[PDB]
Design a protein around this ligand. Structure first.
Ligand SMILES: C[C@@H](NC(=O)CCCCCNC(=O)[C@H]1O[C@@H](n2cnc3c(N)ncnc32)[C@H](O)[C@@H]1O)C(=O)NCCCCCC(=O)N[C@H](CCCNC(=N)N)C(=O)N[C@H](CCCNC(=N)N)C(N)=O
Length: 341
């Protein structure tokens, strides 16, 4: 009964997703319609900027990708996935893509600006979250993965850096740069070293269970203040990941440790989230016994904290990055590669 209504919700959610999946939205827009305010994040082929839309005064977070760098780093399909998926999803804990466009040089995804900053910065600052606090965030990720996986979407980059804290103290998942729609198995080596499942490292065909592994890492990191597998060199991190060995801080409850042993299960076929009972093994776990799943979805649970809000356009919750020019070439770069964008 509790389950039939979940089933109902999911079927409806799929209907909606497919309508947008099958005919993606397209805009319409130019870089010169925006004032750049601050770089919020950078990477090897793009960056994220706080911008103000001049005509309306609206603030947005604009992901800007350099087409030539995308192509050179063979990320074409991934950027296409990211735009197509983000425009089609609709869920309380997923960042909203407002619109997308492209010009001669760049691809643009204009998201709702979440001024609260990354969970990563808040976690690092406080040191660690209490189990009730970690559980509040974890429950939102569980619901979000239940949503995503029913749509055959694998997220593939869970980490506190990608979890924005909104003005209600709830999560907004951002960065769909590695998300993929795929039934069954996929093979790409992608993600973040500390968060990689063993089967990604071992170069196997892997599935949605990698997202549940990643949830184990996240819960561990939220509650300990550091990830379960760390070392100086990536190779050293990978050896630890595939070993089947993980130590817990002495303050972890026995219920938490039991959940983590089942999420950080190196054998994907025994990993929670990936057994016959699917997500319900997780949702029914003793560690989540006090979680009101529907109250979480409805945002009715008092959040552990609400980020300091200094008005529209405040960036105090983000780190400073070196501000670099955004170039727009006279000539169109990589036209055919990005025609579906
Ligand atoms: C795939 C390719 N993509 C690209 O080049 C395209 C552009 C992507 C920008 C991503 N950032 C972002 O997207 C950030 O922008 C904000 N943001 C995004 N959307 C937003 C929105 N709607 N509203 C507001 N802000 C938003 C958020 O701050 C978000 O984190 C790329 O290279 N993507 C970047 C991923 C590789 C970085 C290596 C690393 O671990 N770097 C960090 C140092 C940089 C610190 N960055 C952040 N804190 N965000 C690092 O080494 N950190 C380690 C720990 C890493 C392990 N993580 C753990 N949790 N343990 C460290 N020790 O500090």
């Amino acid at each position: 009964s509790e389950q039939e209504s979940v089933k109902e919700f999911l079927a409806k959610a799929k209907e909606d997703f497919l309508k947008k999946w099958e005919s993606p939205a397209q805009n319409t827009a130019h870089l010169d319609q925006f004032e750049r305010i601050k770089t919020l994040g950078t990477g090897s082929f793009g960056r994220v900027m706080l911008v103000k839309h001049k005509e309306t005064g609206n603030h947005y977070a604009m992901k800007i990708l350099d087409k030539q760098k995308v192509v050179k780093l063979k990320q074409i399909e991934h950027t296409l996935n990211e735009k197509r998926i983000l425009q089609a999803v609709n869920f309380p804990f997923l960042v909203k893509l407002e619109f997308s466009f492209k010009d001669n040089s760049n691809l643009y995804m204009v998201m709702e600006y979440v001024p609260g900053g990354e969970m990563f910065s808040h976690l690092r600052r406080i040191g660690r979250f209490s189990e009730p606090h970690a559980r509040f965030y974890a429950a939102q990720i569980v619901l979000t993965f239940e949503y995503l996986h029913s749509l055959d979407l694998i997220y593939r980059d869970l980490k506190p850096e990608n979890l924005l804290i909104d003005q209600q103290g709830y999560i907004q998942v951002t960065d769909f740069g590695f998300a993929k729609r795929v039934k069954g198995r996929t093979w790409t080596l992608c993600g973040t070293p500390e968060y990689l499942a063993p089967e990604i490292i071992l170069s196997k065909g892997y599935n949605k269970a990698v997202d549940w592994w990643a949830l184990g890492v996240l819960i561990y990191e939220m509650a300990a203040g550091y990830p379960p597998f760390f070392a100086d060199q990536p190779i050293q991190i990978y050896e630890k990941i595939v070993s089947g060995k993980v130590r817990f801080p002495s303050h972890f409850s026995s219920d938490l440790k039991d959940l983590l042993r089942n999420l950080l299960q190196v054998d994907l076929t025994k990993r929670f989230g990936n057994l016959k009972n699917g997500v319900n093994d997780i949702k029914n776990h003793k560690w989540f016994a006090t979680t009101d799943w529907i109250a979480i979805y409805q945002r009715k649970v008092e959040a552990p904290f609400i980020p300091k809000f200094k008005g529209p356009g405040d960036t105090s919750n983000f780190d400073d990055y070196e501000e670099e020019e955004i170039r727009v070439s006279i000539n169109e770069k990589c036209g055919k590669e990005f025609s579906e964008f």
